[PDB]
Symmetry: C2
Subunit: 322 residues, 2 copies
């Protein structure tokens, strides 16, 4: 919320158990690596995946360790953990006593009580199996949570939080990757188009603007076959949209045309991850390099001036702001 500190989730290598958590302070430009291991004398696990901060507690999703850790955002000390998660993706709080945890390889969204760390129920997604089930990012509008369904799916689902039931769905292009809501209460999702030879599909990917109140598609911007966009996101004001599509792209949330010029042109760095400071609009991009050594983060001002570079953990893939 403040933008005064940045957490970086380093995925590590799948099944090698070498995920780590980094913390960067934009004011001092100092990075700290392996902070969870150093504070807890315990490895973070396998494939760190996402994180949210809520009232000085950070909730770190470790996808292939089937766990979310609650940690102090000051000391990085574990205060609790939720285990038993099929393959968790994101956590979104409904209240202090209720949160939803999305999953891959499950047709259910898990409901937890964050005060007890216990799973209290499940939301069954329609027309989904354990074999190809996928739920991902969540946004909330009024009483409803919207969630994109990514791997081998092509839908946004609408959940009534007063009943914990899916009440509607919206079909989009195959594999919407991410989901955010702007200052006009329009949701944005960008699909990745599958891939050549996919058992599911391969098509031109698209960026959609969807009214949150009415769940209606308002705009669809189509890209080229072969593009695999990802990580649509917003600045702090919710009025500038960013995403990855080889380059880093941005546009005003009121634009009716996608710009021809990107924010950061792709040349010598493959952009593995992206975030925007909610405080000053700085843009951060992750470089996974060779997927074996420390990856690095580049920090740009909103005007494109490179102001910092810092090495983190292995395959930095997600960000979370204090």
């Amino acid at each position: 919320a403040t933008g005064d500190g940045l957490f970086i989730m380093n995925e590590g290598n799948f099944q090698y158990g070498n995920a780590t958590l980094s913390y960067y302070d934009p004011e001092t430009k100092k990075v700290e690596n392996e902070i969870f291991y150093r504070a807890n004398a315990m490895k973070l696990g396998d494939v760190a995946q996402s994180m949210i901060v809520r009232d000085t507690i950070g909730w770190v999703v470790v996808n292939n360790s089937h766990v979310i850790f609650a940690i102090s955002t000051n000391t990085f000390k574990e205060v609790g953990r939720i285990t038993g998660l099929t393959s968790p993706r994101y956590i979104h709080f409904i209240s202090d006593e209720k949160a939803y945890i999305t999953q891959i390889w499950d047709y259910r969204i898990f409901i937890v009580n964050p005060k007890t760390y216990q799973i209290t129920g499940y939301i069954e997604c329609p027309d989904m199996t354990m074999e190809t089930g996928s739920t991902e990012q969540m946004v909330q509008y009024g009483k409803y949570v919207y969630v994109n369904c990514w791997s081998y799916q092509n839908r946004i689902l609408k959940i009534d939080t007063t009943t914990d039931k899916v009440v509607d769905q919206l079909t989009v292009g195959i594999q919407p990757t991410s989901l955010v809501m702007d200052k006009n209460f329009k949701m944005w999702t960008i699909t990745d188009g599958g891939y050549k030879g996919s058992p599911y599909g391969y098509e031109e990917p698209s960026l959609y603007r969807i009214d949150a109140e009415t769940f209606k598609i308002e705009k669809q911007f189509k890209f080229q076959l072969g593009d695999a966009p990802s990580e649509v996101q917003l600045n702090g004001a919710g009025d500038e949209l960013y995403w990855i599509n080889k380059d880093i792209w941005r546009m005003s949330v009121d634009e009716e045309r996608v710009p021809v010029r990107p924010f950061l042109k792709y040349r010598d760095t493959k952009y593995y991850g992206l975030t925007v400071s909610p405080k000053n609009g700085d843009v951060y991009v992750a470089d996974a390099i060779d997927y074996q050594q420390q990856g690095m983060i580049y920090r740009y001002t909103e005007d494109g001036e490179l102001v910092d570079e810092f090495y983190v953990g292995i395959i930095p893939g997600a960000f979370c702001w204090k």
Copy 2:
């Protein structure tokens, strides 16, 4: 948010300039009176009316001093103030840089930037004048702010926060007093019925349950002619509704009939304000007594057991949790 500290706004006597601010610590059962004056060497003013707390800053609305003071919730020292307000009632933040302040004797809701303390615009309410205009409490559902219109009015208005315009209205009984939203995203408002000899009107007052998503009245509970109810309030979970109508009344938000038995019996005084601890469900009742002598606060458990009683300022009518 925590429920560890309670502010009490003592209205003082109208036009006497003797409003004060009190702070109560439920753990020690210690009250501190005249805290604003003690911390700032400045009288609070005339008709302190309401307060909200946002990120350790308290925003104290002083209706007949035309000002909202931003104070530290630790030291109670002023950090800034918003002046130039016709006769402010409540403040509701839309974002860090945008808040709405309702008014009596104005047809406009003021828009402010709380970071600069400046008035940045106005929301014109339809079919309202400076002479009898009234906007009062606010709740937000999605992109919309709903507001009750109290003195010489009989409406709830719906404001689109993305345009800062009134986009809809709902007629209710005359003079809806207060507005809350429960855990089912139903709004509740209770009218006072005017009074016999009012220049505006007089009728049986009612409690309404209104769907926030569709702005539709779902339930209307009518009371006896001559009652003048006020101050709907919710517990922390948003599942028990309380209000004043001589006695203190409560019911589950899922109840289909108003109860015949009250929570706290009338005692020949003037219950004037009400709050529920969001931490433990204790119920606090502000008693203005006779509107002249020093008021008292009664603290009860959610089960009706008296826990404490303490003296505050003159006409204690509003509460805010730290």
